[PDB]
């Protein structure tokens, strides 16, 4: 039952990634096709729901995700130049980029104790980092395969990956906040899910469409998936499928409306957020 | 209270590594660089200790590490070819080369239920490898870093590699059977050792010379360490050192007797095996 509260209107490329603390519930991060990212402060409201507060003009390239430490006080950027920058989301300033790959970085990530980074290139190259901006990890699994890569000055520490593949899984995943649960998206709206601790495959979705993007509500026990068709929202328990956030873009071809390509929920899995192929933060709510 | 019980006189290089398997405590495997491995029977005996059963002769370079499946059943070379070969004991064929490396493997292991392979080259890159010998893993540490790397026809699967190093740490290794505690090699016989459990450092030992293999005892709680000394067996609690096997080298230079470069327990450590710079494996027994 989730219903469009608005749209933040900022972007001049798609909004590639969405970001959201728990820290922070007052505030929203995106990133963009436009080599940039924007901080939004949300304020309870009808119109004008989230307002642009701050920018970061750090990249050459496109941004390809973005995500904010537990407290909301930090900012990372993974770009298809191939860096990794780190803000302070009060200043817009950077802190120390990342400078490993070869190829577009495509995500991000940081231990929940907020010192160790999983970056993820194109060429699926996984890499870890210090919050220095020293390279300790670059871990690379086989093309076929996909790969959750976990952590638990230091001069100790410990890693865990774990190797699910599938000749299909296009490379677009998400674990639940819990990190037990992990879906992947093949083609086609091949929804593979997993269960972690279960160490088996828990039975696949279908999206009929392709895919962009997935997320596991923190509240909810629901999957969130964007699509050329839209947005899909599942529950797993019962496994029915709780909606289908399809805008009534005005306008455009039957067959050429913006898609989203980028979720996220609010801190509290009341909200939705949505980048999409109009440079548009598109917003919904579960209701009562 | 370790005594030298004889001389297995086989190969025509160093003997860079001993196997042994709780599955056939009948049998001993060594690699060397004369580009073969050797199986042993050992026999009970003063004279003639163990037996030439048979040779591998299949790499091009020098095996530098070998080892066992938990049974015995088959055996398996990491080699300065750069190839891993896996073998059958009983009759020499190997079964299927692991192609991966580009630089002199180092090292090899295979998770307990033997279906998953962990190499480790020279460059300190890690691989991680079906038994069929295919490439999965291919994670790669900072060279100022240690890595123990360990897992738990498969389309699923788990692993998790540990991370501590020290800017000295020669890239000498080995853990506890119950690989719970890991030790390494810096230099000048600086034996750092850590406590995996508790994730932090107990307190290093001093070889005061040049290290060449550690060997914990599945029995006893004493690790071991060739030395250009000889080879040094301590215990940890207490933290004594409980001997000194310095062999009686006939006529060598106060400083030029050929020394260890391979260690390796029986199944249930109650005798001691090493490989020497003079093609030879030199055998003792904790005796009453």
Excluded at 18 to 24: D, E, R
Excluded at 167 to 180: E, F, M, V, Y
Excluded at 198 to 208: C, G, P
């Amino acid at each position: 039952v989730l219903v469009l509260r608005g749209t933040l209107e900022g972007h001049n490329g798609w909004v590639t990634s969405l970001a959201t603390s728990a820290g922070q519930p007052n505030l929203l991060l995106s990133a963009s096709r436009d080599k940039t990212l924007i901080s939004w402060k949300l304020t309870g409201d009808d119109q004008k729901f989230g307002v642009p507060v701050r920018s970061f003009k750090g990249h050459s390239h496109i941004v390809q995700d973005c995500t904010l430490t537990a407290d909301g006080a930090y900012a990372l950027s993974a770009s298809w130049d191939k860096t990794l920058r780190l803000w302070d989301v009060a200043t817009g300033e950077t802190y120390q980029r990342f400078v490993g790959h070869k190829s577009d970085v495509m995500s991000v990530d940081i231990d929940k104790k907020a010192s160790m980074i999983i970056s993820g290139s194109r060429d699926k190259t996984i890499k870890v980092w210090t919050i220095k901006g020293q390279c300790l990890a670059t871990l690379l699994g086989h093309n076929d395969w996909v790969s959750q890569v976990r952590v638990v000055n230091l001069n100790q520490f410990q890693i865990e990956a774990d190797f699910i593949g599938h000749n299909s899984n296009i490379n677009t995943l998400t674990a639940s906040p819990d990190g037990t649960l992990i879906a992947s998206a093949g083609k086609d709206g091949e929804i593979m899910l997993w269960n972690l601790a279960a160490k088996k495959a828990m039975y696949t979705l279908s999206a009929q469409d392709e895919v962009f993007s997935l997320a596991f509500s923190p509240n909810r026990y629901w999957l969130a998936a964007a699509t050329a068709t839209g947005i899909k929202v599942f529950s797993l328990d019962p496994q029915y499928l709780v909606d289908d956030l399809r805008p009534e873009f005005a306008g455009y071809s039957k067959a050429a409306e913006p898609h989203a390509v980028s979720l996220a929920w609010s801190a509290d899995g009341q909200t939705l957020f949505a980048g999409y192929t109009d440079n548009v933060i598109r917003v919904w709510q579960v209701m009562t």
